[PDB]
Amino acid sequence: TASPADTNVVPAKDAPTTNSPPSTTSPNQAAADANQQQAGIVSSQSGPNAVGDSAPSTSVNNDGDIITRPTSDSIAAVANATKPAAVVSDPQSM
Amino acid sequence: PLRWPGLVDPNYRVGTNDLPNRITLYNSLYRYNFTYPTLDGIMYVRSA
Amino acid sequence: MITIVVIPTAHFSWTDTNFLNSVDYRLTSQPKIRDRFAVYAPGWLRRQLDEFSASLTASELLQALQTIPIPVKARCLLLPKPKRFAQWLLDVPSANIWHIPVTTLRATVASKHPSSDVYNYIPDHVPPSAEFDTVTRRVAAGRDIYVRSTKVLGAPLCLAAPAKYYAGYLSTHQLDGVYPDNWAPDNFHKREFCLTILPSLLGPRTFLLDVDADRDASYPLSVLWPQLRVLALKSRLLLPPVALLRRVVDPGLKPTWSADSDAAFRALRLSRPSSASKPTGFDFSALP
Amino acid sequence: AQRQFFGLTYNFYGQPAPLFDLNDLQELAGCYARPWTSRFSHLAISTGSLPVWSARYPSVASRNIIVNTLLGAHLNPFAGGQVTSHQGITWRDPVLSSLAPVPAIQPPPVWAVAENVPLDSNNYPTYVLNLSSMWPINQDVHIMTMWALSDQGPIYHLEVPVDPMPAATTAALMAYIGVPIAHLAQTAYRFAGQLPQSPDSTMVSTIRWLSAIWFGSLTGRLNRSRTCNGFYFEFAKPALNPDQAVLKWNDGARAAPPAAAQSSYMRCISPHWQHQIVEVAGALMSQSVTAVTGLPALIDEATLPAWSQGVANLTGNGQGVVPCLDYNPVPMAAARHLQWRQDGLITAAQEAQLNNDYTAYALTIERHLTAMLVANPIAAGRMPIQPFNAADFGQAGQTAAAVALAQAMFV
Amino acid sequence: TSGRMIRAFEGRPELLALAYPGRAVLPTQTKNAQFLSTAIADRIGRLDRANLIGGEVSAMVECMELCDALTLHIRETYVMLLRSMHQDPTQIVQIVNECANNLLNSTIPISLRPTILCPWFASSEDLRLQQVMHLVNISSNTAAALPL
Amino acid sequence: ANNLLNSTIPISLRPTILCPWFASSEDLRLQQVMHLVNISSNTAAALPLVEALSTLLRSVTPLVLDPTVLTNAITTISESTTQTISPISEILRLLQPMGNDYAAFWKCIASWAYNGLVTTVLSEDAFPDSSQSITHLPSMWKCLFLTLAGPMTSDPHSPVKVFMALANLLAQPEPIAIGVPGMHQTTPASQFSHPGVWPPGFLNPQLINPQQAPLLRAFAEHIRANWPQPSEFGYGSTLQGSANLFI
Amino acid sequence: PFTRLVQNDVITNVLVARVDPAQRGDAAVDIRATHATFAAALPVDPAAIVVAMLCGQTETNLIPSHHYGKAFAPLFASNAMFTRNQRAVITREAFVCARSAVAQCQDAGFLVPRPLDALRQFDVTSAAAAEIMHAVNDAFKTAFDLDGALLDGLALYGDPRIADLSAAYLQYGGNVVREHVPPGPSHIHRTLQQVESTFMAEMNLFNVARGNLYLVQTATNGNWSPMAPVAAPPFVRGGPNVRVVGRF
């Protein structure tokens, strides 16, 4: 009778962007389409509402850039690109 | 330095060059993020 | 589930164990890679295309096919001739789901010229005086369709009734051809990517695979290649095959975020560790 | 469409002949090509990408100025009804498709030189009879006239109706959100240029609104805080390069429509415009509207150079006369910054900083131009930059009135 | 440097070394060092970004890096050309409707479309020129007309 | 319970007692907005709320849906012959039983309680082809259904869309002028949406000449006169936070 | 509010503002604005609706009191009514703390006390802020053993450098109605401020030291208390004959 599943419905974790497919071309439109198809709506019934919409995607950075890996790794990548040797061997060292 | 006023000139103003007479190597520029939608992406076509 | 529409190249291997291999065998090198793809491309559809190829222009064929959803849930249900078909609704009375009158049924049994009345007013009945697109439009609805001819396109075609009515009305090889469709369905799965020979509306989640080689001249849909290619070209939707190996898809070579330096990319490392004791200890007709 | 136009050729600054070089013609209008839509072919998003800093054409406006001077030597049919030749060059055909050297067998009459020549379409009947193909001339002649009428900055027109924007414009603008002003100006020029259009067309209203919004944001009345139907322009930092602006759409409170329809003519009163892309783009964009719809009313003669006094069909001093305002960018910038502080977008400390930066930026422009003029004295026979005096950079003009208009324009 | 944000080429580290000379390390006073040591601190990385919608790509971004002027002038011109043949949806949908003699009337939604680009158009002169060119590349006998 | 129930709950009152079950209105309002952040524009994660509420409604309501009487009324007036391919075919196609438990009906009611987060709209396929004529009987019956079902949807543009559907079928016999640039009487009805494109004649029916377009004028006046008036009512308990944002 | 036929009162958009637009660094408007309708669209078939309208019946002995009383009782056996309150309270505390943390990291922003401002920290861009918020959001979820979203959306998209949430809807008449939701009296944040304040005085207890570092070569033979020298420092930055190394 008093089914909790019908009373305690709340958005799941990572809800706003979970369905976003991994792509770089048009992530927001692609994510929007994925949400629409995931929700069970078919394009033939949504009509004109499906053409211009866009939704948040994981491929888009908070700054508004196309990202292909977690931002920490991007930070790690640039950091690792610059690591001069701590101790070097040269004849004139005192 | 004349090849690199944007990199070393204190007086360098953004948006300047000396193109017809000399080529600089380090400058400022814009970059774009266009998208190329299909026709149906632009407008609701009359399906079927 | 991003979809990639595929048009086979000049000598595309078809009898291969997996259609996937003929696309690019590097995709089979890693388990971590091959698990990301579905294929679809069923045989029944292949046979239908083989037949209709001689009867539709490229534009018509593309226009007809482009709307079909990925897993075809519908079926074409062939009806037997009225004299034969009418007996079915009395052999099992509950099978008269349209509840055609018993009097009309046995009037048909009595008549020298059994009319189309038994077909008449049956919802979604497709008479021989119909066209290809009529079927395809109903295919988008997913429900099964009742037809009066074998030459149909878009959905697996199976008998509506037991074979006894169609026997005599049809011949052995004809009666044979529908057997896989009589128990057609198989499931389709939600992986990252799904290849398909079925065309579709090119868009943000659908891509055209570019292999840079001439099409299979014998393959019936090769005529669609120019129109598809130009539409993809004008919207930057082509995918070089190497792009498939990356973790995330992008049309391009030498991307910034990836050095593309991995054993998966190196096609020279052809390896065959697995086995299945299959008769093809080797298939010396398939050449990488 | 619009079957008639009026025009006025340039003025010679005491020089005896039109100020352009044969090379300029061969460069800017040669190749036997059609010259009638080339005004944007040599413009780009910003000065950083353009060869405006040295040699010939060493200014943003230089090329268009030379174009206007060039046309002044060949628009005789709209003044005397006949095609003529000047320095051995003339039109190839009565349609004025392109220029070429004169034939050797039957040369046309040689043009007698003059300046500030009034122009009527009716003087050349073949134009109307071939309106469908000769349409582009209408735009360019109008543009040339709008520049010739004024020293310093060119003149353009503004207006705002009492009604809200139609949906069509709303949809159109929602597609041009992230576009810089320069690209927008090209489309407006491209639109009205290539084929006749009626004034009751969606694009015409669209561009009309753009000019209004641009000015409103330029005065700083339209901001992130206060917008026209959600739209407003954003200007780049003066600390790097303020000569850039893009469109934006926002949640901000929408400004109310004016109590009555507002309109006026505008121009920049200071020489800075010659090397400032936002001014050039804004003027060309606005002038495009008047090109397709014609002049709504005669321009007030009260604050114009001597040759502009009482030009037929263009200037007047009677009752049916629209005033023309003018401004200097530096005081305008100060006003814009002040409005931002009052709207609360910035602090007083920042406002002082912004004024210092913009003034420093403008100083370079003045310094560059003034050095460029002595490098190209007008006595040399060609005018790459319009002449001026040092004091011209200090004029405040009617700037106070200008911001007052925006005050009344976006209530 | 902490004070700037730069492009992480992220897979071409050798390329990154070339892109931003200002980020060098200078142990000894060599001729290269004598020059690089004069570099201004902040003339590097992203200068300004046009950010329109949260959780959405920035339409365009301005930065400074290793880039010659001449190539810059070319590519900026090329983009300018592309813009010259782009039009907004309202024009596009109207064109289609008129092409069909106002049959098949259709319209567009009303919402933000940030970064679209549809270089699909040209002037009549272009069309006139192409038509003439097309007429030049045929045998003027019946062979030309029949397919049409 | 709106005093449909009366209850008693005894409890002992010890000095040291804790029942952490209270929250202020500000907390609820803040929580509600946070949901909007988490949902973003993802329609998929918004649907379940309407689904759950509709499920509860069905489990609770005393109303019973049964088309048997309607069937009998139809079948006797119709000839019910497996003939009359005229819309007797059509309406029968919609009359025949559905195993969906009329979920669409309940979804509309549920969506009312969550409008502004999700809106029910008439399905695109339900409209007739805007190029079709009024004489095509199945199209006429479609417009009848749309007009009947209009007020049930939460879409604010349903009135206009309903009106335009009939206007489309009457394009030829009733050529009215639509004072919206970029639109035409033949434009698909489902496309209108945004308020800026509401036809002025729909805004003011007096712009339609009765002798020239009688049916359209009557239809507009009928809509403007009979479309229901919204109302409001209280809920909850004053002893708790409200969680309402706008209302 | 439903609007019926009043055109000037029709709603065009419903948007969530992380920062009041006058204070926003850039437009960064809600993604929802890209959609044709102000809310998610759910297509429905009119025919099914019509059928339900036309055939509605009741049982033969429907006593409204008996039916409703029997129907409503099971619902009140739930505890959702209270979990709603509890989750809301936790959400407030997490929100206030998370906002405070990000504000303290960026060089300027939402007005919060800054006891740790003396510590070195590069100014955080939006991407970095997402990392910080993710850490805070995960910490709370682990601490209170919750499941669901909590603050997920703030970090996953948009600018995490939020100031004060508010919602608004826009009418076709140009009027906009905005509702702010400033958090009520928080508790955890108050004591956290105390923790930071006292840390700035007791950092030594956390194996962290303040001040500079000398490197004089001392070859003594007696006592040595480097963590608290008693002798005068050898020199300082402004001292005579003291050179400062160049940038490289």
Side-chain angles (χ1 to χ4, degrees):
Chain A
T1 53
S3 174
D6 311 317
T7 321
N8 303 27
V9 170
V10 294
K13 60 186 299 296
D14 311 63
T17 186
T18 171
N19 316 97
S20 61
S23 166
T24 69
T25 60
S26 305
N28 296 93
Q29 295 78 354
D33 187 49
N35 292 345
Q36 199 81 332
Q37 178 261 30
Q38 164 75 350
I41 286 86
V42 64
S43 178
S44 58
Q45 293 190 321
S46 58
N49 302 64
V51 299
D53 296 15
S54 64
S57 168
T58 68
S59 304
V60 170
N61 184 7
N62 293 88
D63 293 313
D65 297 338
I66 299 292
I67 53 183
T68 62
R69 72 180 71 254
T71 177
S72 63
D73 328 2
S74 302
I75 272 69
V78 57
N80 299 337
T82 151
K83 285 188 175 182
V87 279
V88 75
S89 61
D90 73 321
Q92 317 161 18
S93 305
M94 184 179 196
Chain B
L2 302 188
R3 297 291 183 183
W4 321 79
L7 182 59
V8 303
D9 170 27
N11 306 335
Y12 162 82
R13 291 296 309 205
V14 181
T16 58
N17 64 80
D18 53 354
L19 184 57
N21 307 112
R22 176 191 295 99
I23 294 184
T24 58
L25 310 175
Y26 187 87
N27 304 271
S28 68
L29 74 162
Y30 301 85
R31 290 189 170 271
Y32 305 87
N33 282 328
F34 299 119
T35 52
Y36 323 96
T38 162
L39 174 59
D40 46 310
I42 288 296
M43 52 156 294
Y44 179 70
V45 301
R46 203 178 192 95
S47 304
Chain C
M1 181 198 298
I2 293 178
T3 87
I4 294 89
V5 51
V6 178
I7 301 303
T9 57
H11 303 274
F12 189 93
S13 171
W14 275 109
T15 66
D16 183 298
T17 52
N18 55 320
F19 157 96
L20 173 60
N21 249 317
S22 302
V23 181
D24 186 304
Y25 64 79
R26 279 174 291 189
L27 276 69
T28 67
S29 58
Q30 308 306 107
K32 205 75 64 177
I33 294 299
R34 71 186 76 111
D35 300 323
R36 316 172 67 186
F37 298 90
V39 175
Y40 196 65
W44 64 266
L45 171 63
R46 206 154 159 270
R47 285 185 289 157
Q48 293 189 359
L49 299 170
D50 307 327
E51 192 283 332
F52 273 86
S53 57
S55 50
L56 294 175
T57 70
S59 307
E60 293 163 324
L61 187 55
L62 162 65
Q63 168 186 343
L65 291 175
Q66 198 168 26
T67 63
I68 299 173
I70 301 175
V72 174
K73 297 176 174 296
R75 292 152 200 74
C76 294
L77 303 177
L78 181 60
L79 303 179
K81 231 174 173 173
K83 194 90 165 186
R84 327 283 283 95
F85 167 51
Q87 192 50 57
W88 192 24
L89 308 185
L90 299 178
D91 302 330
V92 176
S94 53
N96 191 8
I97 57 182
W98 320 267
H99 310 282
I100 294 164
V102 174
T103 58
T104 301
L105 291 173
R106 284 186 164 168
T108 302
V109 176
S111 179
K112 281 189 177 183
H113 301 275
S115 170
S116 170
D117 308 356
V118 71
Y119 305 143
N120 292 357
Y121 222 81
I122 285 188
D124 290 335
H125 169 78
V126 180
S129 54
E131 293 68 39
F132 57 99
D133 67 323
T134 313
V135 187
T136 67
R137 301 168 184 277
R138 284 187 164 95
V139 169
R143 302 177 294 97
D144 295 333
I145 314 160
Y146 294 94
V147 300
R148 217 195 301 182
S149 176
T150 60
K151 185 171 167 57
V152 301
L153 174 62
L157 166 62
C158 37
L159 307 180
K164 68 189 196 69
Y165 312 98
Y166 306 90
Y169 176 47
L170 299 169
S171 60
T172 303
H173 53 284
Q174 302 164 321
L175 300 162
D176 180 22
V178 297
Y179 95 82
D181 313 48
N182 301 338
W183 306 273
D186 191 8
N187 288 319
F188 178 70
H189 313 284
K190 293 76 190 174
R191 297 178 165 184
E192 307 183 43
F193 307 98
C194 59
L195 277 61
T196 166
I197 61 102
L198 214 178
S200 179
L201 279 174
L202 292 183
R205 302 195 302 115
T206 56
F207 294 82
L208 181 58
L209 171 61
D210 186 2
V211 197
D212 192 4
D214 43 355
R215 311 294 102 179
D216 178 4
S218 66
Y219 178 75
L221 279 70
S222 306
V223 295
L224 306 189
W225 177 249
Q227 311 174 7
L228 294 171
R229 182 173 187 277
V230 300
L231 193 136
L233 179 62
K234 291 151 52 54
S235 180
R236 196 178 196 274
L237 257 54
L238 289 318
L239 288 188
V242 62
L244 307 176
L245 294 86
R246 309 198 177 102
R247 196 192 66 81
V248 52
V249 59
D250 83 303
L253 315 177
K254 310 161 60 66
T256 61
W257 50 274
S258 172
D260 294 5
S261 177
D262 179 291
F265 298 98
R266 316 181 307 99
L268 280 311
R269 186 55 275 156
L270 178 60
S271 302
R272 282 292 306 107
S274 58
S275 61
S277 303
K278 56 183 183 293
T280 44
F282 207 91
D283 180 5
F284 295 107
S285 63
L287 177 59
Chain D
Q2 184 66 274
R3 312 193 91 209
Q4 184 183 213
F5 62 78
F6 307 97
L8 176 72
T9 58
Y10 250 66
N11 173 89
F12 300 168
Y13 297 87
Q15 297 306 123
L19 300 165
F20 63 88
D21 177 9
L22 173 140
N23 299 20
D24 295 327
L25 187 162
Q26 186 184 84
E27 163 56 46
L28 214 36
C31 321
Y32 288 7
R34 311 183 77 263
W36 293 117
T37 326
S38 56
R39 290 189 181 274
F40 272 83
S41 64
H42 31 72
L43 296 179
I45 180 179
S46 78
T47 67
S49 58
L50 293 169
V52 301
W53 295 104
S54 179
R56 305 173 71 97
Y57 325 100
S59 94
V60 183
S62 54
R63 304 183 185 278
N64 276 271
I65 296 172
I66 291 180
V67 164
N68 303 344
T69 62
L70 174 57
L71 294 177
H74 298 273
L75 295 174
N76 183 83
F78 305 107
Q82 291 187 358
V83 52
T84 57
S85 67
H86 175 265
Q87 295 187 6
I89 299 181
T90 184
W91 296 104
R92 292 190 71 189
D93 50 61
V95 189
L96 319 176
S97 68
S98 51
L99 297 173
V102 297
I105 270 61
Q106 283 290 354
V110 176
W111 178 63
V113 302
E115 57 177 334
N116 301 320
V117 183
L119 305 179
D120 293 4
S121 315
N122 312 314
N123 300 1
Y124 193 54
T126 65
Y127 164 76
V128 184
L129 296 176
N130 304 268
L131 173 62
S132 199
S133 60
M134 303 191 64
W135 173 256
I137 287 87
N138 168 40
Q139 186 187 43
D140 278 334
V141 169
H142 181 74
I143 289 175
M144 180 202 65
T145 303
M146 299 300 295
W147 291 36
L149 285 164
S150 164
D151 44 1
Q152 289 81 24
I155 298 176
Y156 55 95
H157 177 265
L158 269 48
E159 67 178 337
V160 164
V162 73
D163 299 328
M165 312 195 323
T169 56
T170 306
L173 292 184
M174 283 192 172
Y176 290 113
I177 298 304
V179 183
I181 181 65
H183 291 346
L184 298 173
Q186 171 174 226
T187 59
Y189 181 72
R190 284 276 293 177
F191 162 73
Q194 58 187 285
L195 223 53
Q197 301 297 340
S198 69
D200 299 330
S201 183
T202 63
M203 274 294 299
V204 180
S205 53
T206 306
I207 307 299
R208 169 183 295 108
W209 278 100
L210 271 190
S211 297
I213 297 177
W214 167 66
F215 178 79
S217 49
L218 173 63
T219 57
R221 151 66 57 158
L222 294 181
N223 308 305
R224 296 186 276 103
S225 55
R226 180 194 311 100
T227 173
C228 167
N229 198 255
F231 297 95
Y232 74 104
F233 276 102
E234 175 54 283
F235 293 83
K237 301 184 182 62
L240 311 173
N241 181 11
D243 190 14
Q244 183 74 8
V246 305
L247 178 61
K248 293 291 181 57
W249 189 88
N250 179 260
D251 315 309
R254 283 78 215 279
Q262 303 301 314
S263 62
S264 171
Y265 290 104
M266 291 294 305
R267 67 157 177 164
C268 174
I269 206 59
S270 201
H272 304 80
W273 76 275
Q274 297 199 45
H275 205 286
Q276 201 161 36
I277 199 170
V278 297
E279 319 301 334
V280 175
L284 288 175
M285 169 180 299
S286 309
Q287 289 158 349
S288 190
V289 178
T290 52
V292 61
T293 194
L295 291 185
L298 292 178
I299 305 172
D300 188 357
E301 316 173 32
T303 62
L304 298 182
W307 61 82
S308 298
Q309 298 301 312
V311 182
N313 305 313
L314 298 177
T315 64
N317 57 0
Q319 184 58 224
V321 168
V322 167
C324 179
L325 303 183
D326 56 75
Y327 66 96
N328 183 307
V330 170
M332 171 70 66
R336 173 169 67 257
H337 298 326
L338 179 140
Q339 185 63 43
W340 286 358
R341 199 202 75 251
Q342 297 187 340
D343 283 6
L345 268 64
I346 57 175
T347 68
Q350 297 159 303
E351 183 191 345
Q353 187 63 20
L354 292 169
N355 295 332
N356 299 335
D357 297 336
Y358 196 92
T359 48
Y361 154 81
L363 178 56
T364 67
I365 301 300
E366 170 183 16
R367 181 157 296 152
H368 176 268
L369 284 173
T370 182
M372 201 55 61
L373 190 144
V374 301
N376 305 262
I378 201 166
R382 60 192 297 270
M383 181 179 63
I385 66 179
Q386 179 183 145
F388 55 85
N389 300 94
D392 304 333
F393 291 96
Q395 301 310 314
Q398 315 180 76
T399 304
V403 296
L405 178 137
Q407 189 89 342
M409 180 163 287
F410 299 97
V411 298
Chain E
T1 180
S2 65
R4 283 301 201 184
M5 155 178 298
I6 66 187
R7 297 172 59 193
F9 291 94
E10 192 180 290
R12 323 285 176 165
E14 73 303 339
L15 191 144
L16 178 140
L18 310 177
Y20 298 116
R23 307 185 67 260
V25 298
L26 309 179
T28 56
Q29 184 67 287
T30 60
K31 299 180 71 176
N32 281 6
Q34 296 160 240
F35 167 75
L36 292 164
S37 53
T38 66
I40 309 304
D42 59 351
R43 303 267 191 83
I44 174 176
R46 178 185 52 77
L47 298 179
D48 181 14
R49 172 196 302 271
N51 191 21
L52 280 41
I53 296 168
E56 176 60 68
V57 307
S58 52
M60 67 189 310
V61 63
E62 185 183 58
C63 64
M64 62 189 312
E65 59 191 17
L66 184 68
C67 166
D68 67 66
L70 191 53
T71 313
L72 177 59
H73 176 74
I74 291 170
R75 303 203 179 180
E76 290 303 330
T77 307
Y78 180 67
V79 168
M80 192 68 171
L81 168 63
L82 294 174
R83 300 299 313 193
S84 67
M85 51 176 164
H86 160 78
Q87 294 185 100
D88 68 78
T90 72
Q91 309 313 288
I92 296 181
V93 62
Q94 173 171 347
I95 288 174
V96 179
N97 294 330
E98 291 175 15
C99 284
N101 289 85
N102 296 343
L103 307 182
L104 307 171
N105 311 79
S106 56
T107 180
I108 64 183
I110 305 185
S111 67
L112 311 183
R113 308 301 299 273
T115 64
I116 64 177
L117 184 64
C118 304
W120 305 344
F121 305 99
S123 85
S124 306
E125 295 75 1
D126 314 309
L127 303 185
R128 290 162 53 84
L129 179 62
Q130 182 168 58
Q131 178 80 337
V132 177
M133 273 293 309
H134 160 50
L135 267 50
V136 162
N137 291 263
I138 50 179
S139 63
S140 73
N141 63 341
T142 55
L146 289 168
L148 312 181
Chain F
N2 308 27
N3 306 283
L4 286 170
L5 289 180
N6 201 340
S7 59
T8 174
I9 302 172
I11 181 173
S12 170
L13 301 180
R14 296 311 217 281
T16 162
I17 178 179
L18 183 58
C19 301
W21 311 324
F22 169 74
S24 166
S25 294
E26 289 68 11
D27 300 318
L28 297 178
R29 284 156 55 86
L30 175 55
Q31 173 55 69
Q32 190 79 326
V33 170
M34 196 59 56
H35 285 147
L36 300 182
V37 174
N38 290 324
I39 185 61
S40 68
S41 184
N42 189 342
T43 71
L47 258 291
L49 277 67
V50 172
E51 188 68 14
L53 184 70
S54 64
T55 298
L56 299 184
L57 271 171
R58 259 183 296 169
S59 67
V60 163
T61 178
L63 180 59
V64 176
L65 306 185
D66 184 0
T68 180
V69 176
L70 172 60
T71 302
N72 299 337
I74 290 297
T75 45
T76 181
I77 284 177
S78 65
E79 57 174 24
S80 313
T81 46
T82 61
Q83 190 29 266
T84 308
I85 307 177
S86 51
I88 269 65
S89 56
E90 174 76 342
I91 63 108
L92 259 295
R93 200 67 54 88
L94 289 321
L95 171 62
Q96 48 85 14
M98 315 302 187
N100 310 82
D101 195 9
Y102 316 99
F105 171 80
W106 297 109
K107 287 178 183 295
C108 301
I109 303 178
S111 59
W112 296 347
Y114 288 107
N115 76 322
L117 180 54
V118 48
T119 55
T120 51
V121 302
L122 301 173
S123 68
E124 157 76 353
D125 51 359
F127 292 75
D129 187 331
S130 64
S131 66
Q132 186 56 276
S133 165
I134 187 60
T135 59
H136 180 273
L137 301 186
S139 306
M140 169 263 292
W141 281 87
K142 282 183 168 57
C143 290
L144 173 58
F145 296 146
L146 266 67
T147 314
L148 282 177
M152 291 298 300
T153 55
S154 53
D155 174 9
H157 305 308
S158 299
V160 174
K161 289 179 177 174
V162 167
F163 171 83
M164 283 310 303
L166 182 62
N168 292 7
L169 291 192
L170 296 180
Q172 302 292 353
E174 301 282 48
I176 65 170
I178 297 183
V180 181
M183 308 291 286
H184 305 88
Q185 188 170 345
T186 53
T187 312
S190 61
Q191 292 261 33
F192 275 65
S193 168
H194 189 282
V197 303
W198 285 18
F202 179 82
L203 302 179
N204 171 22
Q206 297 188 357
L207 303 180
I208 300 180
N209 181 279
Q211 296 73 11
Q212 186 261 308
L215 295 185
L216 287 190
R217 179 177 190 86
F219 190 47
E221 295 169 8
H222 156 64
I223 290 179
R224 294 186 54 85
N226 307 141
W227 191 279
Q229 293 292 340
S231 67
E232 75 171 19
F233 56 92
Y235 74 100
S237 169
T238 178
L239 269 46
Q240 296 183 127
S242 180
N244 303 136
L245 286 170
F246 301 130
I247 61 189
Chain G
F2 295 111
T3 61
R4 200 169 183 273
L5 261 57
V6 181
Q7 187 194 17
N8 262 320
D9 295 355
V10 180
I11 291 178
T12 66
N13 290 271
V14 175
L15 306 171
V16 177
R18 302 187 177 186
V19 175
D20 188 296
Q23 275 44 57
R24 218 170 299 166
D26 199 353
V29 77
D30 180 358
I31 179 66
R32 288 183 179 82
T34 67
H35 290 243
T37 59
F38 62 89
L42 173 52
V44 292
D45 176 82
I49 298 168
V50 166
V51 171
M53 294 168 45
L54 269 298
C55 53
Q57 307 178 4
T58 171
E59 295 299 334
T60 58
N61 303 72
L62 175 52
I63 295 178
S65 304
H66 296 12
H67 171 85
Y68 280 128
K70 181 162 293 294
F72 290 171
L75 307 182
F76 292 101
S78 165
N79 297 271
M81 181 163 47
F82 314 116
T83 58
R84 163 178 59 186
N85 307 339
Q86 297 176 341
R87 292 182 69 99
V89 169
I90 295 300
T91 300
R92 171 198 57 186
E93 300 304 288
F95 172 86
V96 171
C97 294
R99 175 185 66 178
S100 170
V102 174
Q104 299 209 45
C105 287
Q106 59 178 351
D107 197 9
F110 179 69
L111 181 56
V112 171
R114 311 176 64 90
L116 304 183
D117 208 69
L119 260 51
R120 183 141 163 77
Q121 170 60 68
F122 71 92
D123 191 10
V124 287
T125 180
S126 174
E131 293 301 312
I132 295 182
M133 182 155 300
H134 261 147
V136 173
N137 181 77
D138 297 326
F140 267 85
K141 279 200 295 184
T142 303
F144 286 96
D145 195 5
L146 286 167
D147 52 65
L150 186 64
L151 303 183
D152 280 3
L154 296 172
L156 289 183
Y157 72 103
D159 182 14
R161 314 202 302 282
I162 67 189
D164 189 3
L165 301 186
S166 69
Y169 64 92
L170 304 92
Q171 292 167 313
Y172 181 75
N175 172 72
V176 54
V177 182
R178 179 177 309 281
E179 298 281 343
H180 304 279
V181 280
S186 171
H187 294 277
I188 297 182
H189 170 266
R190 295 188 297 100
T191 186
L192 182 58
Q193 291 293 328
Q194 183 57 240
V195 170
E196 303 174 15
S197 309
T198 184
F199 168 89
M200 193 47 59
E202 300 271 34
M203 51 182 297
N204 289 314
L205 276 65
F206 302 85
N207 303 337
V208 193
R210 61 169 63 85
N212 304 323
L213 172 59
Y214 287 104
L215 275 180
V216 182
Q217 173 261 340
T218 303
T220 185
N221 193 23
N223 301 84
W224 187 246
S225 56
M227 308 302 292
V230 61
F235 62 94
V236 294
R237 190 179 184 93
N241 303 110
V242 178
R243 280 76 53 83
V244 182
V245 65
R247 191 229 301 190
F248 299 91

